[PDB]
Amino acid sequence: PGIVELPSLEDLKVQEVKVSSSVLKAAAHHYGAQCDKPNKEFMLCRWEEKDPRRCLE
Amino acid sequence: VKQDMPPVGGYGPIDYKRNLPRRGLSGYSMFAVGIGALLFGYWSMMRWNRERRRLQIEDFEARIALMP
Numbered sequence: 001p002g003i004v005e006l007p008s009l010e011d012l013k014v015q016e017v018k019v020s021s022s023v024l025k026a027a028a029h030h031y032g033a034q035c036d037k038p039n040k041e042f043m044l045c046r047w048e049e050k051d052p053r054r055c056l057e
Numbered sequence: 058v059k060q061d062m063p064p065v066g067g068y069g070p071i072d073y074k075r076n077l078p079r080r081g082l083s084g085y086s087m088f089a090v091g092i093g094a095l096l097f098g099y100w101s102m103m104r105w106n107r108e109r110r111r112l113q114i115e116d117f118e119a120r121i122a123l124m125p
Contacts, residue, residue, distance in 0.1 A: 025119060032122030039125045 011056055 017024075024031075045055040082090075 025123065028119045028122045032118075036122065036125070043125055 005053065007053055007056070 042055055046052065049055070081087075
């Protein structure tokens with residue numbers, strides 16, 4: 001029926017944070033402390049519009 | 058002389074009493090020391106559980122800050 005909208009790899013290429021489990025878990029309190037002030041913008045984006053392929057920015 | 062097997066002038070007596078010490082604690086004392094150690098274990102249990110809940114809340118906060 002209706003065609004889908006899949007934005008391609010043009011916008012789907014950002015270098016990942018390729019650290020492992022334990023380092024990311026043990027760095028968590030400072031990670032949420034200083035940064036993660038603008039990720040609640042991302043989470044509010046995600047909960048106000050539940051359509052990832054929107055909050056890519 | 059004659060060499061039978063007599064008793065030599067009479068021997069010592071041997072008891073015939075049901076010799077029972079019935080030692081150990083009473084009802085009240087054993088009861089109270091058991092309940093006292095029970096309540097000691099309860100108090101230490103309460104302390105460890107609430108400090109453990111503090112740490113488990115810290116683990117929850119770790120997964121919260123990790124997620125997005």
